[PDB]
RNA sequence: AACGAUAAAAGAAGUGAGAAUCUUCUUCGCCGUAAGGACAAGGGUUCCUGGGGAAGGGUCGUCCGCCCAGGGAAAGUCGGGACCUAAGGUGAGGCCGAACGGCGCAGCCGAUGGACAGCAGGUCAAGAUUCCUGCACCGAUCAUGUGGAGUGAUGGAGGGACGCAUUACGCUAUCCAAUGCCAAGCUAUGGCUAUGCUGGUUGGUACGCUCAAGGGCGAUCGGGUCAGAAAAUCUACCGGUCUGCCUCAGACGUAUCGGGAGCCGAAGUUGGAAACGCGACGGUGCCAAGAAAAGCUUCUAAACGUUGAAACAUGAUUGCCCGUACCGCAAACCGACACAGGUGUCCGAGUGUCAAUGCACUAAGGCGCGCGAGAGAACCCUCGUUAAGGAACUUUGCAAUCUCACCCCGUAACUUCGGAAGAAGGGGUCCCCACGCUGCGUGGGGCGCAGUGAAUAGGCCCAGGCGACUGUUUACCAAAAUCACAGCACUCUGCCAACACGAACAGUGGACGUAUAGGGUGUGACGCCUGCCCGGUGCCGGAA
RNA sequence: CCCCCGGGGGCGGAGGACCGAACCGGUGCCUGCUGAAACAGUCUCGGAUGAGUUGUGUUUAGGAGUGAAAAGCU
């Protein structure tokens, strides 16, 4: 359920120093909303979530071996918690 | 009275508009509007059908009562008389005891605040709703049934008139304006008068495209266009051979009326 | 030198789109006679 | 041959195998109602970072809008959807039709329009009414309390709801001056010692017994059924009934959050100008007579209650979907090109010049147009001056001069009494001082070949043909005497009109028009006028 | 509309009115003619509150549409 509408976190220099905010930043599956994106972080982390924001991303069109290539698609949200700022600490 | 000008422009010297100090200047009533603008610009399935419409200045449509048959027998006080670019043939806003607004045409010779009177029995005073039957022989009248109820396609425009001849059965006789004779049923309703803004005729145009504020497109001369285009075709000059419409016929004297039923009903002799 | 490509997203898929050539036979004439040439283009919707 | 505008470039320094071309510094020249800035269409990672150097780049290339990789794109309040309707498109039933199909009421879709809650700042290498800080607003659910009862619809009413030109008052944005304030230092060249020079000289919010143009509004008791389907305590009609209230644009003060030249934080004055923006839906005039629907306000119908109301106060909780990077008058859109073309809107400072988005020079900003270096032949293109002459040139004064802006004086035939007319012609134009008036005027003086000292800115007149006139045409050899045009005339057309589209006893256009109207034809403002021939052909009647 | 007796003055601000930028256009010459460009450039010129210009959205088409009319555009 949760588990699986969650991609995997974005790894961005601009991303991690927005760590040291409270502020964490990880890619979903497009066709998700920001109430179950919440609801999905929240039940994964145990953690109020006071703010959400979103994005569509296309996907970048590369080209391997002279055939032109395609897009990837994604879409990254950025949250803000409560005070109590935890995730699992994993953080680097 | 009429607006004439002087010569500061080449135009605007011949040109010529009409005095409107008769007209109350109010917004037209919004109950009434209906709006329905929507020009539709001469054409029908996209494609054009009554050549020479071009756009012109907006217009709303002013809802008019012409049955005038269902308010018999309560009276009106005339409110404003007033502009409309729909009839070009003044009308005339009335108010009923009991509320009721509703238009109707404006009688040449009719002022604000005069009494108007609907229904079988009622008088024969200016602007009143009588049907045939009651009207006094030779008395001149306009908005006119052909049947009734659903009626008022004869005289409805500046000036016109109806004068009623003898009667009949059921049927009266009246002259149309246009010179014919024709029988009408003696419960169609009519309007005491002839109509107002009895002189627009004599308005002048002036210069070109006043008439397309009227939204008329200019014209096309057949003699101007090419063989394939128009039978009035080319040839090095200028000229006739025919006589011809667009589509092909007669148009100076070919009687194009169809062989029916009601020329038994327009039985006394027409000039048109 | 205004020229005749004006490109334009809802013109191009209003008329030529992929939900235009089902609104009528000749249309859906035009897809099945091209799905048969096995083409990938389609209409425009790509 | 060319290397794509004649808007120039020079030196130093750096990096590198390699440099006219890449980076830096300092100058120079070019745009500046643009060749600066912000958006919409459209494009689709072109954006930033780090690398590269095949090809693409009209040369080179260490560079690039090229190639590789990694990042960047954040919305309850901005634009769209979950709201509304226009043309148009659809369209159960319905109307038609060899088939496929064609029409069509309600309803539905459809923004180019209506409705709708946030402003100030900060700032990644790259996002900002989105993130952050400060401080607001909007809907919904719930809770505490006041209230302690009426809510009040797919239906009615009001209202939303609208033209063009001109224009009174007040104001802000915004711009100017200064011996106002504040900050910083220096000065030389001959002088100034600052009264010089340079720079900055307030944004949002909250509260005012503060100043304030302008703008909106009449208001109830009752009668009638015949009006709004019935209802109605809301509307409409009709009758009785007596300047003042509201609103703040904006200014001022106090406070506070910001910003602020600068070496953390100074000053925030007086005088002048001024919008198409704001007050506003103001005023006046005009004819060619200037959308609809929802939201919104008001009424009952039904139903639900009338000791857990509508509504208000605080607190809490809630806030979906899509767009957002970059280019965006162009090297990234359309033109096969890194093309002298084309592309809708907004902002677009200063000095001079009646005015101005004009002209010249310039701010901020952005560029020198992706081959260079020399030579100074013929010829070719775009320009400067030209003796004496002045159209002798030539098809033609074609081309190119001339004239040129504002003020003053003065202006003909002819005329539809408006006009011809900027007729023609002649004069003034700068600087100082004094005098009068509201930058002018009167005078006196001064310099130059010359004073709209440079740039923008009519050559004129006489007489004909044609068309009256503004206007319209052959995208790409014809702009005209062609077309149309106001005005005139013939004829047709009684209303399911004539006529025209149509597979159609469908449906439409004419037209929600009705003979003072509509169609067709030909003439073509205005003035004086429009003659003879009905045998032929056409047309209207007769019809032995 | 207001004064003096159709005239003169006050005022008002009309116009297919005038000059002129944007904008729309294409008058004449030159250039260009394996172009900067498959119709342009510089200079010059016409319209510039109207029969004006322009953006979105949409309707009309092959003997057919559209055409201020060239057999022009599609
Ligand atoms: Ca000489
Ligand atoms: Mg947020
Ligand atoms: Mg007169
Ligand atoms: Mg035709
Ligand atoms: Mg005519
Ligand atoms: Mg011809
Ligand atoms: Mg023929
Ligand atoms: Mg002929
Ligand atoms: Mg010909
Ligand atoms: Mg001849
Ligand atoms: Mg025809
Ligand atoms: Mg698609
Ligand atoms: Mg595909
Ligand atoms: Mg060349
Ligand atoms: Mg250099
Ligand atoms: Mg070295
Ligand atoms: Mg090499
Ligand atoms: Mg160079
Ligand atoms: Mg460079
Ligand atoms: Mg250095
Ligand atoms: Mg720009
Ligand atoms: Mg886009
Ligand atoms: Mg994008
Ligand atoms: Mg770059
Ligand atoms: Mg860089
Ligand atoms: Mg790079
Ligand atoms: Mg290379
Ligand atoms: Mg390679
Ligand atoms: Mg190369
Ligand atoms: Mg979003
Ligand atoms: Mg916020
Ligand atoms: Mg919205
Ligand atoms: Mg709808
Ligand atoms: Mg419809
Ligand atoms: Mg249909
Ligand atoms: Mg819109
Ligand atoms: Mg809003
Ligand atoms: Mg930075
Ligand atoms: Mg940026
Ligand atoms: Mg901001
Ligand atoms: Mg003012
Ligand atoms: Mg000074
Ligand atoms: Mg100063
Ligand atoms: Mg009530
Ligand atoms: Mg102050
Ligand atoms: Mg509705
Ligand atoms: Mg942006
Ligand atoms: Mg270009
Ligand atoms: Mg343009
Ligand atoms: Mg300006
Ligand atoms: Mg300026
Ligand atoms: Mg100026
Ligand atoms: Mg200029
Ligand atoms: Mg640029
Ligand atoms: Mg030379
Ligand atoms: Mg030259
Ligand atoms: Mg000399
Ligand atoms: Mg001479
Ligand atoms: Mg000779
Ligand atoms: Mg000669
Ligand atoms: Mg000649
Ligand atoms: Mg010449
Ligand atoms: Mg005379
Ligand atoms: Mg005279
Ligand atoms: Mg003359
Ligand atoms: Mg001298
Ligand atoms: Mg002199
Ligand atoms: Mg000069
Ligand atoms: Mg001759
Ligand atoms: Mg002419
Ligand atoms: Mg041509
Ligand atoms: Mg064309
Ligand atoms: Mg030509
Ligand atoms: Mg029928
Ligand atoms: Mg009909
Ligand atoms: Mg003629
Ligand atoms: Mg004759
Ligand atoms: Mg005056
Ligand atoms: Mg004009
Ligand atoms: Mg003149
Ligand atoms: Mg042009
Ligand atoms: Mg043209
Ligand atoms: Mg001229
Ligand atoms: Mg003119
Ligand atoms: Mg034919
Ligand atoms: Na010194």
Same mark, same amino acid.
Request: charged share 25%.
């Given at each position: 359920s949760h588990y699986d509408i969650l991609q995997a976190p974005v790894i961005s220099e601009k991303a991690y120093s927005a760590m040291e905010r409270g502020v964490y930043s990880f890619?979903?599956?497009?066709?998700?909303?920001?109430?179950?994106? $919440?609801?999905?972080?929240?039940?994964?982390?145990?953690?109020?979530?006071?703010?959400?924001?979103?994005?569509?991303?296309?996907? $970048?069109?590369?080209?391997?071996?002279?055939?032109?290539?395609?897009?990837?698609d994604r879409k990254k949200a950025i949250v803000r918690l409560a005070e109590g700022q935890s995730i699992e600490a994993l953080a680097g | 009275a009429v607006k004439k000008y002087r010569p500061y422009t080449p135009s605007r010297r011949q040109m010529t508009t009409a005095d409107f100090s008769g007209l109350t200047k109010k917004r037209p009533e919004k109950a009434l509007t209906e &709006?329905?603008?929507?020009?539709?610009?001469?054409?029908?399935? !996209?494609?054009?059908?009554?050549?020479?419409?071009?756009?012109?200045?907006?217009?709303?449509?002013?809802?008019?009562?012409?049955?005038?048959?269902?308010?018999?027998?309560?009276?009106?006080?005339?409110?404003?008389?007033?502009?409309?670019?729909?009839?070009?043939?003044?009308?005339?806003?009335?108010?009923?005891?009991?509320?009721?607004?509703?238009?109707?045409?404006?009688?040449?010779?009719?002022?604000?605040?005069?009494? /108007?009177?609907?229904?079988?029995?009622?008088?024969?005073?200016? !602007?009143?709703?009588?049907?045939?039957?009651?009207?006094?022989?030779?008395? /001149? /009248?306009?908005?006119?049934?052909?049947?009734?109820?659903?009626? &008022?396609?004869?005289?409805?425009?500046?000036?016109?008139?109806?004068? /009623?001849?003898?009667?009949?059965?059921?049927?009266?006789?009246?002259?149309?304006?246009?010179?014919?004779?024709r029988r009408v049923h003696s419960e169609c309703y009519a309007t005491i008068g002839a109509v107002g803004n009895a002189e627009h005729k004599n308005i002048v145009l002036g210069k070109a495209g006043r008439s397309?504020?009227?939204?008329?497109?200019?014209?096309?001369?057949?003699?101007?266009?090419?063989?394939?285009?128009?039978?009035?075709? !080319?040839?090095?000059?200028?000229?006739?051979?025919?006589?011809?419409?667009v589509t092909p016929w007669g148009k100076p004297t070919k009687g194009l009326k169809t062989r029916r039923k009601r020329k038994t009903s327009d039985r006394f002799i027409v000039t048109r | 030198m205004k020229r005749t490509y004006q490109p334009n997203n809802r013109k191009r898929a209003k008329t030529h789109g992929f939900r235009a050539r089902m609104k009528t036979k000749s249309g859906r004439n035009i897809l099945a006679r091209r799905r048969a040439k096995g083409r990938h283009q389609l209409t425009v919707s790509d």
């Open positions: 890619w979903v599956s497009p066709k998700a909303t920001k109430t179950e994106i $919440k609801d999905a972080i929240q039940q994964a982390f145990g953690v109020r979530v006071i703010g959400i924001s979103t994005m569509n991303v296309p996907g $970048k069109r590369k080209r391997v071996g002279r055939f032109i290539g395609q897009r990837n | &709006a329905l603008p929507k020009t539709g610009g001469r054409n029908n399935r !996209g494609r054009i059908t009554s050549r020479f419409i071009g756009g012109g200045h907006k217009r709303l449509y002013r809802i008019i009562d012409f049955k005038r048959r269902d308010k018999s027998g309560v009276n009106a006080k005339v409110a404003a008389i007033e502009y409309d670019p729909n009839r070009s043939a003044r009308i005339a806003l009335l108010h009923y005891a009991d509320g009721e607004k509703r238009y109707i045409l404006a009688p040449e010779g009719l002022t604000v605040g005069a009494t /108007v009177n609907a229904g079988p029995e009622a008088e024969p005073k200016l !602007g009143n709703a009588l049907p045939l039957r009651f009207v006094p022989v030779g008395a /001149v /009248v306009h908005a006119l049934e052909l049947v009734p109820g659903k009626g &008022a396609q004869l005289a409805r425009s500046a000036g016109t008139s109806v004068q /009623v001849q003898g009667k009949e059965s059921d049927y009266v006789i009246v002259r149309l304006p246009s010179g014919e004779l397309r504020w009227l939204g008329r497109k200019p014209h096309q001369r057949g003699s101007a266009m090419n063989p394939v285009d128009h039978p009035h075709g !080319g040839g090095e000059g200028r000229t006739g051979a025919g006589r011809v419409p | -």
